[PDB]
Amino acid sequence: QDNSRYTHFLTQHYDAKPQGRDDRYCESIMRRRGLTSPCKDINTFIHGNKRSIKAICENKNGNPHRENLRISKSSFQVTTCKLHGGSPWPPCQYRATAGFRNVVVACENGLPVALDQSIFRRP
Amino acid sequence: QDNSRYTHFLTQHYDAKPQGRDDRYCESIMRRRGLTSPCKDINTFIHGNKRSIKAICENKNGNPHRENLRISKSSFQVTTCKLHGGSPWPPCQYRATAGFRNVVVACENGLPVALDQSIFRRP
């Protein structure tokens, strides 16, 4: 229900209809979601509807990926924001890599509680 | 220089790489370009690159068509979105007619400032 970790997932990994997908979009949203104290190293946001993402946690749109992870059946518009400069202290300058691929998540009680953020270091 | 009418021309009439050419695309882009309040009667979008469209104002890709208007030499992929109910008030339902034909524009300072939208009343 009101699983705080699910809602923490959305704060850090969900933006339904992004208003941009450049570095500015990252630097704005990475601050709006509180990830700029200290600068979070890298963070990916998923776009689209929420039901598609929750459905990953069940058979409709999900498959077993690893020890405690699940891979989505369909691909998602996503944006990955990576910190550059080498300074953990804000200003938290970012560079954006938008993409389109399947996402990996951990699930608890049919809910995404974490994003496998590792697959997005690679692009 | 003052390029503001060209800037409105692109916002109202240009989508380089449309994401569909069906009713969904129309209703999506008519909302995305803010044209839905009230519902614009009809509005046509041009696809392709900008230079082809600017060239209608020079002899490279244009000829005098009628009064202060010019017809393109080449044809364009275009999509015309027409309103469905007739009520200018939302919801703004649109039906799409994709086409491939010459476009007519008025030109100032080598730039399209208006589209002759009448030719698209004819499907």
Next chain:
RNA sequence: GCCCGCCUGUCACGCGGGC
């Protein structure tokens, strides 16, 4: 009340693929 989100029903459209 206005807005956003969740969830359900009901009107209903639109596109693509496989068989």
Next chain:
RNA sequence: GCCCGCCUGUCACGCGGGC
């Protein structure tokens, strides 16, 4: 037709939240 997928709208209830 059937399956899979994408993408949306109207209206009505219910729940959470902002004003």
